[PDB]
Design a protein around this nucleic acid. Structure first.
Lengths: 79, 100, 157, 206, 151
RNA sequence: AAGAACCUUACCUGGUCUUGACAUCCACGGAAGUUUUCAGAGAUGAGAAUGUGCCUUCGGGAACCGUGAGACAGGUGCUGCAUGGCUGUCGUCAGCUCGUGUUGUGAAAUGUUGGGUUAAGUCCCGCAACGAGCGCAACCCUUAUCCUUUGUUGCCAGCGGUCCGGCCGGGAACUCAAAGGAGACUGCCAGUGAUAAACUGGAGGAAGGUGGGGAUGACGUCAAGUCAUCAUGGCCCUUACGACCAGGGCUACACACGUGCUACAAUGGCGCAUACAAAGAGAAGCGACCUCGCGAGAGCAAGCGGACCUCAUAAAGUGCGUCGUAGUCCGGAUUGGAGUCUGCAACUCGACUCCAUGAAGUCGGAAUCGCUAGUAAUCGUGGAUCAGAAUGCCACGGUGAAUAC
RNA sequence: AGGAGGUAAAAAUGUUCAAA
RNA sequence: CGCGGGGUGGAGCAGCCUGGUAGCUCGUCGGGCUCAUAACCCGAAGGUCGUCGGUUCAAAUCCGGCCCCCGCAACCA
């Protein structure tokens, strides 16, 4: 579907994740990277993807991986 | 349009040549089928380190006079309004209204 | 006729700081009606972000018996929205007695939750509101426990 | 409004392009812009010397600059003093030696531009517009122009509502292509704002 | 035209048989530029017609073509002020022309397998002036009859 | 809008800066530049190595950097009914004016009306009108026939050599390419017409009465449009309506509409084979050929900044075979899966590929649109915009009607 | 050209002020 | 107190009488013609049949109460 090589993410978040990894599943993340793919070593994390004004939280689970973060933070509000 | 925008564009040109101009290599040879090792990953990960702009896709490219982002001609570097405005003046070398 | 603006302005947020951070999508739950004072306990819904459920409560405790790990902690940053039950004797213009007080008493009146039936002469009236200042809450309770037809008029939970 | 620019429609017929030279897209626009630059700079420091038109030529990396003016003596400063002063600032704006050629036009009223800004000059003086128009007009007609027509538009005199005015004398066959209809503009700023000035001048053919 | 009494367009007669009218008949079936295929369809129909009719084609066609050819038409000229029907003698060019137009018309409908074949059936039915094409012409005859009161 | 992922971008939310992203002037410290680490979303913020060069009449030098102060700066803030320039439009409609003269107290009129004629206040004639001007026409470009010029990367008849490929000697006739010219003028005749313009037919002629097409758009109207391309008078904001950045939005979706694409099929789909264009574009671009992949593409890598190289076997069409009138081998939306390419990045939100999926639709109410010739119709090719992103726009040839009393 | 006879159903309305 | 009749889309009326399936006109809505509106043309939705209960397999319809609305009567006193 996109990018043959290297399920892309932005570094600041990677390290943010790593840091939380050894630190343990703790306080929710302040990622603004909706573009970053969700690597397996992120499950259980309660990262909060920015939403254009809101910074809505998302509780990662196995399946939430190849799918990019943006998918879990709908932008437009309808009805 | 808005001196700030034009300055913003040239800033893009500055950072453009300052980096990738001789550091597009990362996505180049490193993001290539030869070293799919962590090295290639280093590439895709060091690329972000580079300031957001600089990358050519982030070169909106405006008119050299008015600076109107739309209707720009890569040829004269001028927006249709100005290219016409000068062409009529007799400015542009050999450029009369065609009639084929 | 006076029955959105809250969700449009709770979006202004700053109202909750979850485990060291605010700005997270969240909303006060309808099963506790968390009040500014006694902090809260927050739960993370799949969509619609964090679901605050007020500190200490059963449904919030039921979640503990499913995905307790997801549950999180927070405070208030900066007494909007709440309900109040006023079971009372009959009525006889009592509906006015609640409103008579409420009028220029200010507080929002969207809790049209009355129910006059039962068996005896005791109509069961409820009232959701969106009272602002915490002090205002107190003046109401003193001005509403007073009413002759009223037998009870306090923070429904 | 919709009348074709007279100078444009006759480019391949009578009117030579003001900026003769050549290049390719690989280095074209650059030469075109810098061209504009020098023409702009001169527009500035020569508006006081009554330039008519700045033709530019770009041969062998070099940038030649033919300059039409009615008063070369003031353009040149003193013994090419200010002239070379210009060639300096010119090649400075082009990073290339510029052969600054200055050609005098000796019929100041027989040019469009000169007359045009003669008018703007007058509106700058705050002289009543119409006097200025009839002025330049008669000057042209008695100076042999087989045709002339000028126009002014805007507040002119500071009217609440903008108007447009025009006088003509002699044939000005805008559709007769071979007709050498000189045509120039020079917007005229006034306290009430900008005011348009356009001038047509018909002289010959083939 | 309101004025330009323009002379008509001369054409290119048929490559197979000699009829120029045949060629015209190709044209009034030639959708788009597929004139090749149109021509294919044409000769096909003539071939099969020459089969069941047993006759020629160059004229096995006309005995069929004549059957639908109109005698008079009803252009709605509105003499006076208020509008009503007016029969009129049809031009020979428009005669055979409109005739073909109708034949092809009923042929476009009553579609079978081949276009050519269903059309072959048409022309046969026209030879027995029982095709829908003639019925169309017959209709024009009635419009002529009922309005024969006018001039 | 000649192409919204970021950028664009002007909007939102949030985090940010104020003489500032952009400009000069003064002063202060200082090469500019270079490299690198942390934090942060980023902007920025915080440290650290490195560099410190031509006037040296040497505060020193141009530059550039950062700092301070203020003049200022910034505005895509309003105001097209304050404007210029620019544009549509009525409309390529043939009209619209002026001089002096004359008529009338005057507004004005006559000129321009009238008999003809014309694509045309085009033309002739008469006339209190006589002339002039903007416009019509024409001068320009393109296209159609011919001659001259020169002959590559073009072409290649006739000659010779052929691995019968203009492939090779060789050829300047030919296609063609551009340069220069010829030619068409109601010029010839018949007819009509007031011995006028002109109209009608023919001869010849590539071409015929403006041959085809384009270019060019009058005096003006709508206080039409644009103060957001620009420029500009006002007004308005100026520790913010300015300036930076991240994410978002411009792609929302019960609904309505304009303009298009694609179909509903049998003059058609599908399969194999097969013939015939013009127009263009191309350098941090076009990218052969060969290898890999079902493919989009990938690796490798000539040629080309171009009549040679590349995009690049055009498609309809043609032959053969099939499907045989069913929602059907029609239709291709939608959708899942798996991919490719672009680009920091493809979820919101790209394109394209593969496997599968396979809806509405069986020629559309009232109503309404274009079009008279290489047009309509149908078919594919290309270009600007462009990292990528056409069913749009623009451009090019292929095929090829009907009808107009 | 001197003259006669033939010749179109229905189709309403438009807020206020406003420029050398 | 009395007798008779009626309550149906937003309006007016059907259809009930004689059980199953509610139609007409305007109006509302969608499109068209028009410079624009109406008119006109195309197309469309819309009615728990006063309320409750009952009779029945089924009730707009049959039956009873209730609320409304109108009618005729309220005489000899």
């Amino acid at each position: 579907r996109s990018l043959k090589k290297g399920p892309f993410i932005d570094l600041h978040l990677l390290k943010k994740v790593e840091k939380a990894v050894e630190s343990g599943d703790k306080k929710p993340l302040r990622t603004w990277s909706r573009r970053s793919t969700i690597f397996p070593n992120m499950i259980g994390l309660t990262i909060a993807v920015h939403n254009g004004r809101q910074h809505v939280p998302v509780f990662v689970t196995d399946e939430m991986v190849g799918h990019k973060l943006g998918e879990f933070a709908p932008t437009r509000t309808y009805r | 349009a808005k001196q700030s925008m034009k300055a913003r564009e040239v800033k893009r040109v500055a950072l453009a040549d300052k980096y990738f101009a001789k550091r597009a290599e990362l996505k180049a040879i490193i993001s290539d089928v030869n070293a799919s090792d962590e090295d290639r990953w280093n590439a895709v990960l060091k690329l972000q380190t580079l300031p957001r702009d600089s990358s050519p896709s982030r070169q909106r490219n405006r008119c050299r006079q008015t600076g109107r982002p739309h209707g720009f001609l890569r040829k004269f570097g001028l927006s249709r309004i100005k290219v016409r405005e000068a062409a009529m003046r007799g400015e542009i070398p050999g450029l009369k209204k065609a009639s084929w | 006729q006076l029955q959105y603006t809250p969700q449009n302005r709770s979006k202004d947020n700053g109202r909750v700081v979850v485990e060291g951070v605010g700005n997270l999508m969240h909303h006060i739950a309808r099963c506790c009606q968390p009040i500014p004072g006694d902090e809260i306990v927050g739960f993370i819904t799949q969509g619609r972000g964090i679901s605050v459920h007020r500190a200490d409560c059963e449904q919030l405790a039921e979640l503990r018996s499913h995905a307790p790990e997801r549950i999180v902690d927070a405070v208030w940053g900066e007494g909007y929205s709440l309900v109040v039950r006023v079971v009372a004797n009959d009525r006889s213009g009592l509906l006015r007695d609640i409103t008579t007080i409420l009028a220029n008493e200010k507080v929002n009146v969207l809790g049209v939750a009355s129910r006059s039936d039962t068996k005896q002469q005791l109509a069961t009236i409820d009232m959701t509101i969106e009272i602002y200042n915490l002090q205002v809450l107190g003046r109401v309770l003193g001005k509403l426990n007073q009413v002759p037809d009223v037998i009870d008029a306090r923070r429904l939970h | 409004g919709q009348k074709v620019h007279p100078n444009g429609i006759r480019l391949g017929i009578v009117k030579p392009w003001n900026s003769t030279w050549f290049a390719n897209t690989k280095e074209f626009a650059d030469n075109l812009d810098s061209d504009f630059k020098v023409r702009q700079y001169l527009t500035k420091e020569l508006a006081k010397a009554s330039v008519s038109r700045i033709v530019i030529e770009r041969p062998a990396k070099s940038i030649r600059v033919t300059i039409h003016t009615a008063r070369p003596g003031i353009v040149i400063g003193k013994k090419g003093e200010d002239v070379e002063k210009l060639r300096k600032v010119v090649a400075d704006i082009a990073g290339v030696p510029a052969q600054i050629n200055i050609a005098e036009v000796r019929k100041p009223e027989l040019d469009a531009k000169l007359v045009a800004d003669s008018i703007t000059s007058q509106l700058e003086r705050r002289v009543m517009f119409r006097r200025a128009m009839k002025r330049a007009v008669q000057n042209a007609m008695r100076l042999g122009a087989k045709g002339i027509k000028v126009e002014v538009s805007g507040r002119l005199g500071g009217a609440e509502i903008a108007r447009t005015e025009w006088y003509r004398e002699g044939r000005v066959p805008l559709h007769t292509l071979r007709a050498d209809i000189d045509y120039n503009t020079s917007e005229a700023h006034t306290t009430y704002g900008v005011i348009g000035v356009k001038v047509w001048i018909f002289k010959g053919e083939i | 035209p309101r004025r330009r009494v323009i002379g008509q367009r001369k054409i290119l007669p048929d490559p197979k048989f000699g009829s120029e009218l045949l060629a015209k008949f190709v044209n009034i079936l030639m959708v788009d530029g597929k004139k090749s295929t149109a021509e294919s369809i044409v000769y096909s129909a003539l071939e099969t017609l020459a089969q069941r009719s047993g006759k020629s084609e160059l004229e096995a066609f006309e005995v069929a073509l004549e059957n639908v050819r109109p005698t008079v038409e009803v252009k709605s000229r509105r003499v006076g002020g208020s509008t009503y029907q007016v029969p009129v003698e049809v031009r020979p060019v428009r005669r055979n022309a409109l005739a073909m137009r109708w034949i092809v018309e009923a042929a476009r409908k009553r579609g079978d397998k081949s276009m050519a074949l269903r059309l072959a059936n048409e022309l046969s039915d026209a030879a027995e002036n029982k095709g829908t094409a003639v019925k169309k012409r017959e209709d024009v005859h009635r419009m002529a009859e009922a309005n024969k009161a006018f001039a």
